[PDB]
Design a protein around this ligand. Structure first.
Ligand code: BEF
Ligand code: BEF
Ligand code: MG
Ligand code: MG
Lengths: 129, 132
């Protein structure tokens, strides 16, 4: 299959570089942005197969960024992109809030190639590495 | 004590990943985008120390993308970002067209890690790699 086009969103530069490097080495075409504000702007510009969205970010958090994307998708009329929460905060009540905000799934930090590969396959049908 | 923040722009995924990888290994915080259109929008949004701009891209080429950035900097009233052409197409007349378009300098493909560090030091005063 063709390489998946993936967006990674994280306010922690080390966390962002880690997920971006794992996905790029698995053969994905990766865009990486440092904020929810950037996530909205780049999802308007580019068509991604899937978005990895950090939850805790200042100003606009992951849930607010996903709501912004869902509002723009409905108003602009664009096929919805799968949004996967990728966070250190994934308790039962936090999971519920993420799905309520319009996210599709969640992974817990720290990430690994196996978790990324399986979630991309589940939601896009595209394989990695 | 933050590392240099660098933008790379290239419509060829393999070319883009190569320059992105070399700059990341040198210890820069690197953003990589696939078009001139993307270059304009991300330069409005984020503060880069320097941009590496591919020339040949469909719709908006690197020269048109540099002019777009320079027009936005002037109207918005923002400190200009250095823009370095990173291209396979560097004939005498092409080099002159790049400078005419508002690009500061050029490097020829295939790129090398030493030239990249030098260009960053020249245009930003920031060091990389062992001297970061
Ligand atoms: F800043 Be996070 F939700 F890992
Ligand atoms: F598409 Be280029 F100017 F290497
Ligand atoms: Mg965070
Ligand atoms: Mg090109």
């Amino acid at each position: 299959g063709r390489p998946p086009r993936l967006l990674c969103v994280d306010d922690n530069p080390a966390n962002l570089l880690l997920v971006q490097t794992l996905l790029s080495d698995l053969g994905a075409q990766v865009t990486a942005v440092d904020s929810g504000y950037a996530a909205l702007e780049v999802v308007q510009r580019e068509r991604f197969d899937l978005v990895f969205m950090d939850v805790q970010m200042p100003g606009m958090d992951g849930r607010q960024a996903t709501e912004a994307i869902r509002r723009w998708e409905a108003e602009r009329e664009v096929s919805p992109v799968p949004v996967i929460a990728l966070t250190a905060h994934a308790l039962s009540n936090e999971k519920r809030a993420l799905l309520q905000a319009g996210m599709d799934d969640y992974l817990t930090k720290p990430i690994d190639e196996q978790q990324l590969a399986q979630v991309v396959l589940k939601w896009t049908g595209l394989s990695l590495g």
